Design a protein around this ligand. Sequence first.
Ligand SMILES: Cc1cc2nc3c(=O)[nH]c(=O)nc-3n(C[C@H](O)[C@H](O)[C@H](O)COP(=O)(O)O)c2cc1C
Ligand SMILES: Cc1cc2nc3c(=O)[nH]c(=O)nc-3n(C[C@H](O)[C@H](O)[C@H](O)COP(=O)(O)O)c2cc1C
Ligand SMILES: O=C1CCC=C1CO
Ligand SMILES: O=C1CCC=C1CO
Ligand SMILES: [Mg+2]
Ligand SMILES: [Mg+2]
Ligand SMILES: [Mg+2]
Ligand SMILES: [Mg+2]
Lengths: 399, 399
Amino acid sequence: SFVKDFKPQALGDTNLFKPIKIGNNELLHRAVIPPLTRMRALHPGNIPNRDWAVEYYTQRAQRPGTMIITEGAFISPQAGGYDNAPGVWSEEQMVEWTKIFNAIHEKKSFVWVQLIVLGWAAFPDNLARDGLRYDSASDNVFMDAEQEAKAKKANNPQHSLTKDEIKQYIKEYVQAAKNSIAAGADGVEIHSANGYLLNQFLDPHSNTRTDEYGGSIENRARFTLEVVDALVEAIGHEKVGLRLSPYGVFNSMSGGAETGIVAQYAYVAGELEKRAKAGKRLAFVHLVEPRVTNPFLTEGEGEYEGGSNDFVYSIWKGPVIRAGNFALHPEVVREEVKDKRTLIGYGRFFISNPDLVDRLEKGLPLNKYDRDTFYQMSAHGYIDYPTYEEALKLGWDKK
Amino acid sequence: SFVKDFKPQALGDTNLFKPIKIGNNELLHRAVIPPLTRMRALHPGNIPNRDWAVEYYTQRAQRPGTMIITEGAFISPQAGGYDNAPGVWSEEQMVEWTKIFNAIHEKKSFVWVQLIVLGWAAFPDNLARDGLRYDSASDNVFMDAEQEAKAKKANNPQHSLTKDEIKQYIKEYVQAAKNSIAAGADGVEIHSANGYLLNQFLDPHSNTRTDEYGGSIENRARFTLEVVDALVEAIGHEKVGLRLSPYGVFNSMSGGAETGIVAQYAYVAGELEKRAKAGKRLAFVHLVEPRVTNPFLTEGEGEYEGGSNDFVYSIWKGPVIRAGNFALHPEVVREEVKDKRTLIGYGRFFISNPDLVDRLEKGLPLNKYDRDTFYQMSAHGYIDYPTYEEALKLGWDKK
Ligand SMILES: Cc1cc2nc3c(=O)[nH]c(=O)nc-3n(C[C@H](O)[C@H](O)[C@H](O)COP(=O)(O)O)c2cc1C
Ligand SMILES: Cc1cc2nc3c(=O)[nH]c(=O)nc-3n(C[C@H](O)[C@H](O)[C@H](O)COP(=O)(O)O)c2cc1C
Ligand SMILES: O=C1CCC=C1CO
Ligand SMILES: O=C1CCC=C1CO
Ligand SMILES: [Mg+2]
Ligand SMILES: [Mg+2]
Ligand SMILES: [Mg+2]
Ligand SMILES: [Mg+2]
């Protein structure tokens, strides 16, 4: 059914519908699909879903010139720990990704692979089963009591990475980025948000290290910036973006409660601008808004009102993608896109509306999403959400 | 005469005219006199002007409940280097300051002493004459070629402070703050802006140190925060404010050209909020706006459009005073004061309008200022600017 208490607004008269170039890609509008883990990849081997993934992405690529960022993809077995999220390290995986990229390109849209490394968000028992470590920045602070306990039970207690192990992850990021481009992707997004491994290094709660990778703003940003630099060198700055969530608390990050949090992220933004001024400007910075500090809370919940991402614009001078509770708030989007280098990521409502872009342009009702099928091994709630035309045929205008 | 091309706006219907408490002081409105060096102090001894200073401050205290921040005052001979700026280290000086504070209090207004230390902005020949060093953070970068050359000619080449010498300055800050309070001041403002000594430490252009006082964000902020902590301990957090100019370029600071500049100031703001949450909240943070990156350029010149101070509000949660080209822009003030913890500093137009607050409330014409007498040894252009009533009697409505 359609969202009941929503008053749509046509956004066709705003910059949301002005073309913009991101990296090598000529976008025809500025509604971006942010990375959305859906858990349809198959075990063993973390293989993108052989039955449904092409169709899922094809549907959501339907508006020409749409930028799509993939669900997070593991750079290596050690980077993983969810059996039904995909990877980008193996031939088996890349065969499926190539089909997905080809399908998106046939719709005249674009695709950027998000590269993820779980750190303490991984399931330690899955990792133990596969003979893998349970990794984080530190070994004396944990995501939660359940994760700590699971790790101990699995004889796999949380491990603080050595410098050599950090370097090994960097090698895997590089190879994953190369794999992605070779298979046809337009670029990659480095995930440094949402409390995954890179964020675990950025955040002083999760990073209690006393070596060069912790203990100061510059040290906490070191790993993230090393990944940025390694990927820029490997595949070019025009094929690399970075995702950050300054005010996020998901996966036990600090958010605004940490008085030093803005400084930590301002430093990262500054270092990206320094690289840009030196001739290597990333394609984009992607920010999760304080509008959504935890994406598994219903829209309007977990909204942090004590901080703004606006500071990033004083520092980084390139494109900025912003995501978080924008679908239900066209009045906010109308104001944000007045800035000519701002794009808007729509997550949950792109799950439920394959034709979201048309709906945004024309001010149409939105399909309600079904949270129960966000992570299911099913075509249901994945590829069977209707377009607006299909919804009318189903009588949703009268439900 | 009155400013010709100015269209005044009555601001009485805005928060500019709502009372607010700053430290121990119940302000009746939010128009603040920022620190304004006027060079009427007499040599020898850096003595506040025995003839005119009481009258100058009395005039500008005339609106009950006005917060006045004094012209910068040297904490010690070594902190100085301008013969006609006042100090707060000697009995002779404090005798005059006491008269000034008493006069301001008789008008039911308030007075905060700005404490300044010049560093590389000092005149090295004055310092040499008096047997004093020419100090800065570093010894291999200079304010400009003329200052470097003057220092060498005076056999007083710029000196990078030792840790012991930093500690000595801290002792002098503490004693200067004590002197100020004992003489009747309501509080002190620590000047860490405008390219003076503390700013010389904050800024990576002027601070090339490799010890604990340079080489990182935390290290560059160390001296400023040590002064904050020493003064909070000595006279209490409710009697201490801090002035910063993140985007300033005056006295050869970096401004927005330094990609790390926002992070540097965000760190300072975060450290103040951390102290506040731990029970020691400074009375205020005072920011110079990017509207004025150099206060000796005419209003509208040297305006940096690539940055905003708004980031500070995401971090520091106490009162914020903002200064820079606000007198000629009531339309901007009207928007800024919608934030309920924002005060507005009016500098140059408080020089020329002793009754500025009345003029702001009622939307009256403003007296033009005379830049030639900003730094003169004269009552002219100091205490002879008329109130609005006096200006009408002089026929300024018809000039
Ligand atoms: C089911 C689901 C899966 C997500 N997967 C990812 C992911 O793989 N990587 C990532 O960076 N963010 C992920 N997110 C966060 C979203 O990209 C987005 O920032 C968030 O949902 C807020 O935007 P929205 O209000 O438009 O949904 C996910 C969110 C949801 C609800
Ligand atoms: C003549 C003059 C003297 C000043 N003296 C000081 C000073 O002693 N300390 C300080 O922090 N700022 C000083 N400033 C900067 C002002 O406080 C203020 O930030 C600046 O003039 C911008 O505000 P405005 O546009 O309202 O004048 C001075 C400015 C002027 C023009
Ligand atoms: O980043 C996020 C938010 C929810 C899932 C991921 C990656 O697996
Ligand atoms: O801070 C400033 C700006 C002009 C003079 C000072 C202090 O002497
Ligand atoms: Mg151990
Ligand atoms: Mg169901
Ligand atoms: Mg020397
Ligand atoms: Mg003259």
